């Protein structure tokens, strides 16, 4: 009976591929033959934030485009002021191996996680002064890779046990569980309206979930290695995925397939972070070869480089008003560009 | 100055930075080690002399030196993704059992292949390995009624004990192929005190070698 269901699955995938081929008429690079190029983009290191000692693994902006969080492997989680290069808090951690950090949209809580299989949630506005651990969520069997806040009551985490979870903070119970991947999931991004999200695993696949019911809705498979970072387009109808084969692609939700691929022969190294700009015209991608590249999101031609790091960039993120981009690498420093 | 108040904030920031520097100085004293092995390798033994899911942190102090041991065999996940966080360690402790007679594919060959994999990794090119050969007395009983040709097809020589052990040790040390690291060997046995001093000497030697080469004194 197993072979019958295998044949049925083959029929299903043939139907899917046929439909995807039928709905395709011309490529997006053929549509953009007339629109003018954006020119080269030059950016300067405006601020350098030198507080840590070990390598930096995560970073996330705040909502007001001024506050920042850094998570590094020396056991510290220190929030910065971007305009005045100050430190406003210094949170000592329990486990020194951290791979993710988060900042709440309202600025009241932050999160952290790592190889200790526990997502910790810290309270910043305590009446008694210092910052404290509010909960310690522990339901996974593998390590955590990416944690994102929905609101002050619920969080979404992605782990190494090939599963993702939605938590409720006041209770500590894993409200809904997302499953279906074959290998480790290593990235996650929330849509602007926070109703549905995407995740990127190490089986060269990215899936689209919905947080209300918990059902995988679309599967996209183009890559040839592990996918390491994911971010949406601003309008919530496309996203960009970075992998370990020197390639990053743009997938369309409505068309249900790939649109462009961004690779140039000079680069062999893999991606570690991907983000967009405010309007979606530019695409920023970190790399293992110690630099950051800017692509034309509609023309697919490099428009500049953000060099200036002694070691590989591991985190990357832009603000909510499009003013600055922050890059953090294993050299224990963070940079701000404008 | 034109910084109004706006002035206590900088004082708090400097206090925080002082705390970061003091914590770094305090945490610079300890020595970091990583523990690797395979099933039935016997790493639990070398752990149990130390004590007297996720990552476990066995902890001990010997002769005014602060030690940390990380056993990550419990992390049953993809290895390529969580080893890079474990670079900058002082040394890697490797456990090999002198019992290759049975299939898990031979266990000894699996251990040799895994040693080759970990020795030539991109991140661990310059991290010295301290090597432990367990079951010293069991292999002594075994070799009395078995040849080493079964483990290694190419072996030629005696079927005694010391020579057989030396052949295995040489085969393992054959894999380093780099000029800036060394493999230290100690043949442990059950009921054997001192396996902590075999680590103290190695760690001191590694630290002084790294200091000599770092200050360009070579």
């Amino acid at each position, epitope marked *: 009976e197993l072979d019958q269901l295998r044949q049925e699955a083959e029929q299903l995938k043939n139907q899917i591929r046929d439909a995807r081929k039928a709905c395709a008429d011309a490529t997006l690079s053929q549509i953009t033959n007339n629109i003018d190029p954006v020119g080269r983009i030059q950016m300067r290191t405006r601020r350098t934030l030198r507080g840590h000692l070990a390598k930096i693994y995560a970073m996330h902006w705040g909502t007001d485009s001024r506050l920042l969080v850094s998570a590094s492997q020396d056991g510290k989680l220190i929030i910065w*002021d971007s305009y005045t290069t100050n430190k406003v808090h210094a949170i000592p951690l329990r486990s020194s191996w951290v791979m993710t950090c988060a900042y709440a949209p309202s600025g009241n809580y932050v999160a952290c996680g790592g190889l200790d299989n526990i997502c910790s949630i810290y309270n910043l506005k305590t009446r008694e002064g210092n910052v404290r651990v509010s909960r310690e969520l522990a339901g996974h069997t593998g390590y955590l890779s990416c944690c994102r806040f929905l609101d002050d009551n619920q969080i979404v985490t992605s782990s190494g046990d090939t599963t993702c979870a939605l938590w409720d903070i006041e209770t500590g119970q894993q409200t809904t569980t997302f499953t279906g991947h074959t290998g480790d999931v290593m990235s996650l991004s929330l849509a602007p309206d926070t109703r549905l999200f995407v995740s990127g695993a190490c089986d060269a696949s990215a899936k689209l979930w919905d947080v209300r019911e918990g059902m995988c809705r679309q599967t996209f498979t183009g890559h040839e290695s592990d996918i390491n970072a994911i971010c949406f387009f601003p309008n919530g109808n496309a996203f960009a995925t970075g992998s370990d084969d020197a390639t990053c692609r743009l997938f369309d939700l409505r068309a249900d397939q790939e649109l462009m691929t961004y690779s140039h022969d000079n680069i062999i190294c893999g991606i570690t972070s991907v983000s967009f700009s405010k309007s979606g015209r530019l695409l920023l991608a970190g790399y293992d070869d110690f630099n950051c590249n800017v692509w034309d999101a509609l023309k697919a031609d490099r428009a500049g480089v953000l060099a200036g790091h002694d070691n590989r960039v591991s985190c990357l993120g832009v603000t909510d008003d499009g003013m600055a981009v922050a890059t953090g690498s294993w050299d224990s420093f963070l940079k701000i560009w404008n | 100055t034109l910084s*109004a108040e*706006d002035k206590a904030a900088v*004082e708090r920031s400097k206090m925080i930075e002082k705390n970061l520097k003091e914590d770094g100085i305090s945490a610079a004293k300890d020595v970091k080690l990583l523990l690797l092995g395979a099933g039935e390798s016997g790493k639990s033994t070398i752990v149990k002399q130390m004590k007297i899911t996720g990552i476990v942190e066995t902890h001990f102090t010997f002769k005014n030196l602060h030690f940390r041991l990380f056993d990550v065999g419990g992390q049953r996940s993809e290895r390529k993704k969580w080893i890079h966080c474990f670079e900058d360690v002082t040394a890697i402790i490797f456990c090999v059992a002198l019992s290759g007679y049975d299939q898990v594919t031979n266990r000894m060959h699996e251990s040799l292949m895994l040693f080759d994999s970990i020795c030539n990794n991109k991140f661990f090119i310059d991290t010295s390995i301290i090597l432990f050969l367990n079951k010293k007395d069991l292999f002594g009983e075994k070799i009395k009624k078995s040849p080493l040709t079964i483990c290694f097809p190419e072996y030629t020589g005696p079927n005694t004990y010391e020579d057989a052990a030396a052949y295995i040790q040489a085969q393992f040390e054959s894999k380093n192929r780099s000029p800036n690291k060394e493999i230290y060997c100690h043949m442990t046995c059950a009921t054997d005190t001192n396996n902590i001093q075999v680590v103290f000497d190695a760690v001191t030697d590694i630290i002084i070698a790294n200091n000599l080469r770092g200050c360009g004194l070579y």
Partner: single-chain antibody
Amino acid sequence: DVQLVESGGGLVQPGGSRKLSCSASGFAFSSFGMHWVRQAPEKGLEWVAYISSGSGTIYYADTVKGRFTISRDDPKNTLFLQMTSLRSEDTAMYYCVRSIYYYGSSPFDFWGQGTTLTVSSGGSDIVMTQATSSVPVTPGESVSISCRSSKSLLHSNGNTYLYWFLQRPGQSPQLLIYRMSNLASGVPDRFSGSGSGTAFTLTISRLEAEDVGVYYCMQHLEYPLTFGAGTKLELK
């Protein structure tokens, strides 16, 4: 709970000396700045001293420098004020406040209950005026109070340092607005503020009987800190 209790006050003949202590229990005392704000038998508030976290910076009022001294002993979480050559103008209630300072913080949030001290018979400051002395109000009505400064309070950083307090009868003052717009934690949403530069207002909507007292405005642009006379509110 957060608690600040003072003790060590009494009737002392002029020219004497005395030591005051402020005991703290319920917060991270070592990471706070502490002030001393005093109040005459029936007059308003007057700032006295200040000590920072780590005891780095100390400031004094010009009228009390040299006679007094301020110290803290953070292992035992107690604050001190040692005063010598007492004068007849120093008969006052003495308070103890906490003044955490960072981006987005809420300084002057908790005020102690104070101690009574009585003594027997024997030009660049930012003067701030509150022309109204009292306003009679009826429950449920909307009332607006004013505080006019001398120097414009808008620093180049975009900030504007003005605070508002409320002193209920027979109690200790609370904090309502910090930096001219930010409503404090625990205070009702009824209160709101506005202004531009030197003209300041505080708007109360649907006032009830629980918010009757005297309102003070404080400047924090530069030391020394200055208060106002305070506008009183009374029923009917």
